[model samples]
Target: TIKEMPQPKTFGELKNLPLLNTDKPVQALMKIADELGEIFKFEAPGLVTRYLSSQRLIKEACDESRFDKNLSQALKFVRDIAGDGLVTSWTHEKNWKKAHNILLPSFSQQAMKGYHAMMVDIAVQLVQKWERLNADEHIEVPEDMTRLTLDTIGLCGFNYRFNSFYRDQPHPFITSMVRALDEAMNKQQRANPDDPAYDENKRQFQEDIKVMNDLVDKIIADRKASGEQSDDLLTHMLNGKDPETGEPLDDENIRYQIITFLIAGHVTTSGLLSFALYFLVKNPHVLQKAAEEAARVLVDPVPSYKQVKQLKYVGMVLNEALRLWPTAPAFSLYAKEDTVLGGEYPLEKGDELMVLIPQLHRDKTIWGDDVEEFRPERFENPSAIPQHAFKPFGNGQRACIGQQFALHEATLVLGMMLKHFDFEDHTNYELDIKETLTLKPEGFVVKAKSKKIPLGGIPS
Candidate 1:
């Protein structure tokens, strides 16, 4: 017989498990892990979720033959809006294959260089805005970074400009995304029919998604009517065919791809930037070293396309930041077939297992006792990182396709911010992470002063 995994004895016992009704469910899960050993199951009657931890356990789940990405409750609701987009699509979906290959070129090293000017185009806008409001301004870091990322993706993904910086508020698409995904998050909870808000929420979710879909439709129609050839992501998807498959995505599919870009690329990239800055401010030693590297490497006034690639130390800062606070947090996976982990716990076919990234990153056996400290030096030798231990971008072929692009953008933006101004956590804010499809520092505030060196060397 297969080994029996530990779990609550009955429904009564399961109801009393430590992992219930916490505002921060991930934190609660960590506490539960300590109580129930590394690997255990949380179940109710016919339902079960095997919460897998420890680096060794995850390594087994990491193997694609035994496990693959699972569309958990929240993701299934996301399908209501995203349809067959890359992140929302199932393992067997054809659109994921077609879209993945067709869109692959947009994130290539060559493609990134082509998009560099636009990145600088929006990056400079942020620095300039900060300079104009430089001193005495208590800036909410996440909000501005949200603006920075949404606009960057808007211009880079399509030729469309959201002009987020010009507005006092976020674009309508951003507002819609907020409510739409908020509904997605809300969808996970067991509902109450007695509450007057139930049907209203459903109606409102539809409206929010309608706003997002219609906006993407407009952007698509505008591009097709323009009749010009440019090299943005929208143009690539409209024209490029898979190098091997040689198939183009249809118009409806293109909308899902762009919405996926907005959903996946927007908040997640901003979260990466937000967390990176938070880590930098909290640990000034790392911040100073990062600033020095940015000052030295960006010797010119503007970051040249090649200059962005040279931010090695700054890149380390982002890597360490992600290790500490993964933006996307946990990813759900399930066994492709019946399999055993570490030759112990048995996972039957189609059984869901949630891998907690934060816990795995802090494994005492791998990351040392001071894993809580913000240390970029740990990543000095990239090749030495254990295969499954560090997974901010996830693992295997299904890992984030835009990993390079996100890193490049974050490294470039952070480097630029470091060179332009010295940032201080004026409020000395403690990190109270707010979860919204991604993690961000809630109520985190910083002061930016433009008294620092610009990109080029100066003796003014």
Candidate 2:
């Protein structure tokens, strides 16, 4: 088992597990599959059929406990299009093994050890900018936060220094990818709620996936053709081979995983961190507690990996933020074999299983009447409910591979930033949820300002 299989009934069943990963952008197919499945239940067969075929394949693959089906389909899509010469999608089962091999090391306990350099570099830059401003008191934080994660992924994932943070300009590919994802999601919602356009919308989603894949292809090809290799994860992926098949991973395989991880790793972390800052500013008490805790935990020369663990409020704040604004919002799975779920769900094999994490998270039963309150203390102890109830990163074999990376990055970024500055609400920007593939901030802007700490005022 990936972790523990928490049986669930209704969204409330998602109490114990984290619901952050269920957000559609983090995992695309899972989100759409759920929406379509619900539509099917309400008499929308044609709309559901498009995904049925894909679900069958995924289910079979999962049943075998093999990642081969997912890998082959992902790679084959690239080969069939032959749209980009550099980006050849993987068609081999062995390719997945190779990709997984690289990922395990890249995100390993030891490998993450090197991440502090990148984190500290980004944090120091943000702090210096605050000093330069001499306390502006309020500035939008999402962009800066995005820059930080984007830079980290650039340095760590590809060893490419896009310098996006300093430049403060969105990368061509990142911008395009986000737009495409948004467009695809809009199309999904616009579907006549009973039209064949549902299938067309899914097809369009592939086009959006291409925007990133093609970009990755170009980067990998240029790097390899130059015979240049860097210590980043992408270089390792391009150069690494599968032990089982003894075949090198093709460019497409590398592109798929890299772009996917980059999107999954970069945007969500940036969003969550920004959300955390927003929450701290909104809740003055939380901010004070965080500052005090930071003073004690990071009293050393600089925060090390060990020091990160000591920042309890950091995790509590993040957990609370996740409860309010999970980076990835909803996902779905299929009924593998006409299974009966909770005795009420007489789902057919091809029937869709839509699990909306947002609805699940805010359920009055699981979160209590005060669910909306920003209470990090709620997470001091794990929820006693079932596991699937609170999946920030999702559950099952299909759960996100980058959850730990996101967690680590969030912790590091929050710790270092809180140690220096405090956020103040400027515009009181409401989180306009973009109904697209990812639940991103449509108008996400928060004020950034350095906070001064007084003696003996930090929270324990």
Candidate 3:
């Protein structure tokens, strides 16, 4: 009877088969692996969509030398949504290559070193805000982290300051950015175009995009008007030249890059910090271990970039969080030529491949029996796992560009927060994860109190 069941080949036929109807799209996509096997195909006229969860296959796909990035036409359909920046342009395109080469230096170790003071200063503002809160009062973790990141990106990425932490209400830039991101996701998942909301959604999308672009334009004009340049990311972008063309980036293209950093830079790390905090509150011993490490390493009130580099346990906690809750959970790539995936399944030229990051990171084969557990010790000996197996920031030449910046910022913030405050679960919350463009904890709230550590040392 089971063998007699007809397998769906077309998108239409796939739709005919029942799947999970949960409100969250990401969870529904994950459920597809269980309902249908890991390797499944859907068909449309002149198109084929294949999903792959095998870590080996995913790993091979990420190898830039073997396979190029698969930017499907469907993704290109949304090119205007985010603008033609690093994320929107094709990996092989001149725009991406030029921008990548020019901007690469801005996120270098030296640049991150210079950025340490700014990050700590912004983080201190957050600590001050928390200190003002009642000992038992609850704070929304997502909102707090989002504001902190917004403020950090504003100051560090460009010279703009949103004053996000100081304001009672979100700035227009943030509000428009959020609306645009949400609309982009909704449009991406629009299975039925005939829905009545299409016209209204289009109008709103354009309006929000205008607001976002205008804000970027204003920031650029203001910076030029000031006639003062700081050694920040924007200065690097303005002064740096493409290695191949030896030309500076155009204004429109520069705006695209700034918007890309402003959006991607903050949101992903915010999710990481929020989820790490949630996990810490749930696991007390792990929190205490991190706290002790923070206390021991951070002899001074503020840590320099080099001091944050020595934070092993704190780094482990962030890595584990990324492993469990990678913000950009899945990405799509296409086969360049006819190649066999996992040395078995044959893929034709132009066949689309979807790499499910969550599945790959949590594979029991790679992570052992405790694959689902939030154990930071897994990263204590990272060599125990395959180099390609743990790819929260992805792999190969096209991997995340700002990973160094993200890690340093996160490590510094975590170290400072752990040193100053003790976070406890206010609601005894279970993981209420949600997905927009990035995966984030939805409504995870916590109570915090400033912790006091006595200055002392035991003589040996």
Candidate 4:
């Protein structure tokens, strides 16, 4: 069965990992996939990980009976940062189910509409900060996009203010989490537990965890001290009983949910906006189309909840951005039983199968001759392609539960940013993605020129 599947070209690629560079392993993997075809495997000490890049093969793997989500090597490490949170918890982890049932109503269609005002509130904050600046000002797209996304989730999810726009640097939580997550993801090559080398390396990582823990504790304590009940995530976590278990989330798990929303909630959406901006800058034709769509539908100073959904073309631009660069770039699956993918490649139980999103999204078989082009219209009808082929959020039941929240936030912000301010890649920089917990356009800066006008004044 192992002989039936293609293996990495050499033991050296596995031993040394010719990753091309540190950040874009996906690039290296794709180059190999060109030689290896759709399915391939890399044998490791304790595991043999396989990758699937074709739409048809991925469609077969998506069959829930035979496969399910498994925390990949990276996400398993992320478990230290996102403990018992829905993001990295195992399939049978009881807290995931409890939190899932308790939090499901918070992410419902009706709840998203309820969260609308908070989303608008933070979008305007970013707009105002950008408005005061001259056209030539270099705005760090990723940084400010993080501010928008972080602040939006803060207000909408927790009824708290990161006040990210008002601040010069991101909140300490962001800084600490970045450090913690960096260590969590990297340093996967575990040294002997008894070695002083391994023990000493984790001291800084532990410090980072303390930093996250300290801030989260304060946020929870403040809410409890106030005894002020508001309709938000913090409130729900504080008060909502698990439908299945008849218990509220524990005080400690509430902190996990808060930190979870801060990390899993905001990181991907920020990447979406930052990447969307880069595409608009490179493809001015697309920018014009999206600008027209935003201008047509987003008539209010900040568009309403319903108006955001009405921004069909702008939404497509964001969708296209994801097609090109999915922030949550990869996910892993495992077989429920011994299975074969696409009637070949025998997949043993507990075999790791990675659905690498970039190649899968860019698969020419599904996307055709112009697969390399920046064409938002390809998603003009979402159902045009196999659903498994286009997974920016992620796959299946254990998918990012905050997906709707992420989309609503990105669509509103991108539309509003296009409507009022224009971003230009003034330096003509090539796209380079910085991979951390998610992928962001690294060193990407843009110039902003506001197009806003007085209510009764003629256009600028």
Top-scoring candidate (TM-score)? 4
**Candidate 2, 77-183: lDDT as tens digits:** 33333322222322242354456655567777777777656666665555666555644444547667777787777766776665665564677667766665555
The models' CA-based lDDT, in order, is 0.81, 0.58, 0.77, 0.80
What's model 3's overall lDDT?
0.77
Q: Assess every candidate by TM-score.
A: 0.93, 0.73, 0.91, 0.94
lDDT score, candidate 1, position 137: 72
Once fitted onto the true fold, the runs of candidate 1 whose alpha carbons sit more than 4 angstroms away are: 1-3, 8-20, 44-46, 191-197, 242-246, 452-460
Given candidate 2, what's the lDDT at residue 414?
Answer: 85
Ranking by TM-score: 4, 1, 3, 2
Model 2 worst lDDT window (10 residues)? 1-10
Model 2 misses residue 285 by how many Å? Answer: 0.7
Prediction 4 global C-alpha lDDT:
0.80
Per-residue C-alpha lDDT of model 3 across residues 1-460, encoded as one tens digit per residue: 1121113423354352233224365566566655665556644344456666657767788767557776654346446655577777877776788888888888888888777777877877777788888765788888888888887878888868787777777778778877777766665445565588698877887898889888888878878887555878888788889878998888778888888888888889999999999889988999999999998998876676778999999999999999887887767787788877777677778778767777777677778878778899988986687866877886666679889888888898899889988887878998888876678999899888887633232111
Model 1, 264-351: lDDT tens digits are 8878888989999998888898889999998889878888867887889998988888988888888889888887778877767899
Estimate the Cα RMSD of every predicted model relative to the unseen true structure: 3.2, 9.0, 4.4, 3.2
Which runs in model 2 stand beyond 4 Å of their true positions?
1-45, 49-98, 134-138, 189-218, 221-231, 383-385, 442-444, 451-460
Model 1 poorest ten-residue lDDT run: 451-460
Candidate 3 residue spans exceeding 4 A from truth: 1-22, 35-37, 42-47, 72-78, 192-196, 452-460
Q: Which regions in candidate 4 have their CA more than 4 angstroms from the true location?
A: 1-3, 9-21, 189-195, 198-200, 454-460
